[model samples]
Target: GAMGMSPDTARRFDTEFAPRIARAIADLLNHRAHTDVVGYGGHGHPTQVRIVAPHAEHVRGYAHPLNLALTWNTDEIERLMEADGAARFERYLAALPRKLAAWENARGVDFGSRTQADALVLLGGLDFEA
Candidate 1:
């Protein structure tokens, strides 16, 4: 008999892995990154925050970049949406610069001071060194 696979791993890739990649991309373009709460979740669903890089349109021949949706569990979402939400979110944003640096260090890529065109080039698995 053939082994069966569960959807749990795929679900995690969709909800976590992919979104983190998107977050990393946004972090690389911090100046143009925009984030917003697009939906609230009840029951077992998670709330969604959409991250977008609108300046990506400047890259010639590239289609508009897709918005990345990050899901936060109800408990965390509640805290994020509370009266101190803006401050809390600002704290998170403050950490992203270091996070992006660390990520670049691990990947052996120098992503600092990169522009939208550079980002798109890197995303294509091509060299962006100048």
Candidate 2:
């Protein structure tokens, strides 16, 4: 994920960036690289990166980049709503523990704030990266 504030971004791309922005973001993301932000090959701008994950291998699998989604937790919320009186705030809070456990176990990443507060969020973009 990225953390930034640039003209209220409508689109966010992490995989492949355009030529110019790539130079700028890459420059910002690296500290050892020189301040000269040129077009292409200059100042050894990220030839390749190998980030190591720190984890207890006994708890986590050895091979993985298990990118996960957690909207299914919303389903669990619905289940709780049906099974019990989840209209009350306490019941809703009670419902989240197991869902959070599932997300942690599955190693998922969600940008939403809180399940009850802002249940669903849609991030969309069109021609916003320039």
Q: Highest lDDT: which candidate?
A: 1
What's model 2's lDDT at 94? Answer: 47
Positional deviation of residue 67's Cα in model 2 after best superposition, in angstroms: 2.3
Q: Which residue pairs in model 2 clash with each other?
A: none
> What are the lDDT figures for the candidates, one per model?
0.42, 0.27
Q: Each prediction's Cα RMSD?
A: 11.8, 18.1
Candidate 2 lDDT over 56-126, as tens digits, reads 23333233322222121222222323324233324433444454354434433221211111222222221
lDDT of 1 by residue, 9-128 (tens): 334334543455456656667646665543323334433445555553434443435344444333333333344743555565567676556544654433332222223222222111
Candidate 2 error regions (>4 Å): 1-60, 72-90, 102-130
Error of 1 at 101 (Å): 4.2
Candidate 2, run of 10 with poorest lDDT: 5-14
- TM-score, cand. 1 vs. native: 0.35
RMSD of 2: 18.1
Deviation of model 1 at 86, angstroms = 12
